[PDB]
């Protein structure tokens, strides 16, 4: 009864596919944002510079 | 007659519509952009005595909407200021006669 079984079970009438899905490698990156400098003026605005 | 009959009363007086630029550390485009947008802004509320306070209410809200939010300007007769500001972000033009404007984005 045990081979009658083995023997139920054949190629084709229980085929055995694989199957996977395409899965992106993974990856570790790095990104420092840094904003533009930032510089110190000094005017001076008297009213014969201006009219000068 | 030329330079020698023009008295500072008479030179400001014969011209007010005139244009001078001091500084520039900010880029050739984005001025262009500005100085025509302060020039027409001031003379509006220029009104029948000049309000300092009403020219830099509208300056300040035109340019927080045309380029960035924390846009700060200031006009005057005469100052002496230090001002930290980020690169290619500051234009001080004077306008005729007694009016000092700097403008900067911090």
């Known amino acids: 009864e045990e081979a009658i079984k083995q023997t139920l079970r054949n190629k084709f009438n229980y085929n055995t596919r694989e199957c996977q899905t395409i899965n992106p490698s993974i990856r570790e990156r790095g990104v420092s944002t840094e904003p533009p400098p930032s510089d110190t003026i000094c005017g001076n605005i008297t009213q014969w510079e201006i009219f000068d | ?106």
């Open chain 2, 1 to 106: 007659k030329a330079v020698t009959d023009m008295d500072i009363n008479e030179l400001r007086k014969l011209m007010i519509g005139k244009a001078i630029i001091n500084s520039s550390d900010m880029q050739g485009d984005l001025l262009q952009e500005a100085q025509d947008v302060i020039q027409s802004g001031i003379e509006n509320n220029s009104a029948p005595v000049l309000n300092i306070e009403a020219a830099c209410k509208y300056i300040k809200e035109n340019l927080d909407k045309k380029f960035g939010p924390t846009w700060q300007c200031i006009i005057g007769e005469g100052y002496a200021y230090d001002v930290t500001v980020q690169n290619n972000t500051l234009l001080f033009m004077f306008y005729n006669g007694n009016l000092a404007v700097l403008i900067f984005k911090s």
